[PDB]
Amino acid sequence: PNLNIVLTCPECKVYPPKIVERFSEGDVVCALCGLVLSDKLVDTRSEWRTFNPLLDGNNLSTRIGKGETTDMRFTKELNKAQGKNVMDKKDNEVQAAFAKITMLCDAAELPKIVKDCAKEAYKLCHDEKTLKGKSMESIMAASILIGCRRAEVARTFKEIQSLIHVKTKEFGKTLNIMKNILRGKSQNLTYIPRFCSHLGLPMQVTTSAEYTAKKCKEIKEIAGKSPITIAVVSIYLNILLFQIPITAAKVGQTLQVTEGTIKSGYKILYEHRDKLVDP
Amino acid sequence: SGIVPTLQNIVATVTLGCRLDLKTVALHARNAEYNPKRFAAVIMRIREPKTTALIFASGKMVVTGAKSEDDSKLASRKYARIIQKIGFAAKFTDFKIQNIVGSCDVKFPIRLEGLAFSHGTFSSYEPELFPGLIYRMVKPKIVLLIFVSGKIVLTGAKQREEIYQAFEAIYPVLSEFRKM
Amino acid sequence: KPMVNESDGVTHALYPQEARLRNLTYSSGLFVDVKKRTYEL
Amino acid sequence: RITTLDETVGVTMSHTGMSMRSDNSNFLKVMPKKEIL
Ligand SMILES: [Zn+2]
């Protein structure tokens, strides 16, 4: 019911408040007649000095731990009382889910941005009807992959699959319906420096595999057959152009790619060697 | 244009209206496969038309594998005639085609990334999981598979006009995201 | 030796100057030969 | 003394986190009613 204070100049009254705010003097003044509009200005920086709504919401809580001078009997009685009131809210799954997701993300050495994006995705899904289960592992893996796709990061399905055994198929279905959830609440180039880091290659081979990846994306023929094989055959050609020796077995056992696949792509790639030269 | 989709599979269900026993049926029959430890239904096949029918103990039968509607209906009548020949009081009733699957070719490459970017609310493209594109059309409700080489698959239809309207409603979108 | 793993995933050598300019932590990675055995007793 | 690994780091750092290589070691892997009557 109203409750909206609007400052106006009773002497000017010619336009909505086009005023200036003097913070050093603690006043707000009309920039026309020079008449002050308010004195004793409050600050927002000063009250913030002593001190998450995006995830926790408006819920408040306080810990009970042991005191300087106290008994261990009272600490247990207070914690057991909270253990009986923990059923009053169904938010125990968010803290445990964020704890295990925190352990997995900390185990994958991913930045905090992907962690916050994955936690935000799991908070958007949470406990809806279209999820209908998945045993808490597939929503966590798919949430990590979603938070990876949102932060412009690249992680292959075999990497998260190497972390969590989600049986692939149910992972693909849960990731699909999860993507539908995200669409209802309204790029292979990044993989090259990662595999070049796995092989320890110079920067010229990395950007050479970048130009080779883009050009091979423009030439068509085969189109891709999943971008991983295009990446490994691109790095394979860019490394067979120089003299640093890795052969096909070592790069096939390190990047987990079939030798017959990198040779099958190396055949047609060697056929398109003409227009792939940068200098 | 001028391209017409060609049907590839038709799935229909026929209710016989009786009950069966599976050791005797599998013992007295000719061309049939039955194994309760894997699939509790007899897999009966006929030569003309080349179809496959799953026969259950509750009388329900699934005739699938035909290329046209007359082959599915006539084949269903042949399976029902075989069941009436074995020694049961079956009756060819409740013939309803449940699925129609066709395919065609556009004869030009298709941009699947741009198609998944423009029609993001109807497409689901994941090349590392499936190199084709899954386009879910609203009207008619048809599920289409759009590959790179131009082969267009159409599934999830009850009639042929839904397939034809799906291809006629997807052809300009494919012509927009071409390459050569 | 001292190293830095960036946000995109690349890990390179670190120098104290770039460590002071990028507000990083001059540290080095630690590995351990972890041996596992299974007795059956 | 402690031995310092001199490699290009990216190999070891690749072996740290997700490296698309799992397993490779076994450890902690763990009717008629009348006749029935
Ligand atoms: Zn004024």
PDB file of N, CA and C in Angstrom, chain A residues 1 9 26 42 71 73 89 122 127-128 156 163 206 209 231 237 240 273:
ATOM      1  N   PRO A   1       0.817  -1.218   0.000  1.00  0.00           N
ATOM      2  CA  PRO A   1       0.000   0.000   0.000  1.00  0.00           C
ATOM      3  C   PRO A   1       0.850   1.267   0.000  1.00  0.00           C
ATOM      4  N   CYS A   9      11.064  18.785  -5.072  1.00  0.00           N
ATOM      5  CA  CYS A   9      11.330  20.140  -4.614  1.00  0.00           C
ATOM      6  C   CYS A   9      10.039  20.944  -4.663  1.00  0.00           C
ATOM      7  N   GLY A  26      26.548  14.661   3.557  1.00  0.00           N
ATOM      8  CA  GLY A  26      25.455  13.854   4.066  1.00  0.00           C
ATOM      9  C   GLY A  26      24.079  14.401   3.757  1.00  0.00           C
ATOM     10  N   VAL A  42      22.205   8.345   5.261  1.00  0.00           N
ATOM     11  CA  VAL A  42      22.689   7.052   5.719  1.00  0.00           C
ATOM     12  C   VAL A  42      23.659   6.474   4.695  1.00  0.00           C
ATOM     13  N   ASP A  71      30.142 -27.821  29.788  1.00  0.00           N
ATOM     14  CA  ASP A  71      30.229 -29.261  29.952  1.00  0.00           C
ATOM     15  C   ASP A  71      29.924 -29.957  28.632  1.00  0.00           C
ATOM     16  N   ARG A  73      28.219 -32.627  28.381  1.00  0.00           N
ATOM     17  CA  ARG A  73      26.873 -33.191  28.420  1.00  0.00           C
ATOM     18  C   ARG A  73      25.862 -32.250  27.775  1.00  0.00           C
ATOM     19  N   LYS A  89      12.410 -29.600   8.197  1.00  0.00           N
ATOM     20  CA  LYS A  89      12.687 -29.054   6.877  1.00  0.00           C
ATOM     21  C   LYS A  89      13.391 -30.104   6.033  1.00  0.00           C
ATOM     22  N   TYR A 122      21.914 -27.681  -9.954  1.00  0.00           N
ATOM     23  CA  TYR A 122      21.263 -28.631  -9.059  1.00  0.00           C
ATOM     24  C   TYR A 122      20.187 -27.957  -8.219  1.00  0.00           C
ATOM     25  N   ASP A 127      14.317 -31.198  -6.629  1.00  0.00           N
ATOM     26  CA  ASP A 127      13.398 -32.338  -6.547  1.00  0.00           C
ATOM     27  C   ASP A 127      12.136 -31.994  -7.337  1.00  0.00           C
ATOM     28  N   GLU A 128      12.204 -32.165  -8.652  1.00  0.00           N
ATOM     29  CA  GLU A 128      11.062 -31.961  -9.527  1.00  0.00           C
ATOM     30  C   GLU A 128      10.438 -33.309  -9.883  1.00  0.00           C
ATOM     31  N   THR A 156      35.177 -33.948 -21.440  1.00  0.00           N
ATOM     32  CA  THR A 156      34.613 -35.028 -22.236  1.00  0.00           C
ATOM     33  C   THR A 156      33.734 -35.932 -21.373  1.00  0.00           C
ATOM     34  N   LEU A 163      35.133 -40.409 -13.619  1.00  0.00           N
ATOM     35  CA  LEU A 163      34.939 -40.027 -12.224  1.00  0.00           C
ATOM     36  C   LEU A 163      33.768 -40.780 -11.599  1.00  0.00           C
ATOM     37  N   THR A 206      49.838 -25.867 -30.456  1.00  0.00           N
ATOM     38  CA  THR A 206      48.488 -25.660 -29.942  1.00  0.00           C
ATOM     39  C   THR A 206      47.678 -24.761 -30.869  1.00  0.00           C
ATOM     40  N   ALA A 209      47.066 -26.522 -34.124  1.00  0.00           N
ATOM     41  CA  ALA A 209      45.910 -27.404 -34.027  1.00  0.00           C
ATOM     42  C   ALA A 209      44.611 -26.623 -33.883  1.00  0.00           C
ATOM     43  N   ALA A 231      39.815 -33.794 -32.844  1.00  0.00           N
ATOM     44  CA  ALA A 231      40.863 -33.154 -32.056  1.00  0.00           C
ATOM     45  C   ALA A 231      42.141 -33.984 -32.060  1.00  0.00           C
ATOM     46  N   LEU A 237      48.215 -34.665 -36.779  1.00  0.00           N
ATOM     47  CA  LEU A 237      48.791 -34.074 -37.982  1.00  0.00           C
ATOM     48  C   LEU A 237      49.738 -32.935 -37.632  1.00  0.00           C
ATOM     49  N   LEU A 240      52.860 -34.483 -36.457  1.00  0.00           N
ATOM     50  CA  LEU A 240      53.623 -35.106 -37.530  1.00  0.00           C
ATOM     51  C   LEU A 240      54.170 -34.090 -38.521  1.00  0.00           C
ATOM     52  N   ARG A 273      45.616 -32.115 -46.590  1.00  0.00           N
ATOM     53  CA  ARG A 273      46.785 -31.391 -46.097  1.00  0.00           C
ATOM     54  C   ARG A 273      47.042 -30.091 -46.854  1.00  0.00           C
TER      55      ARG A 273
END
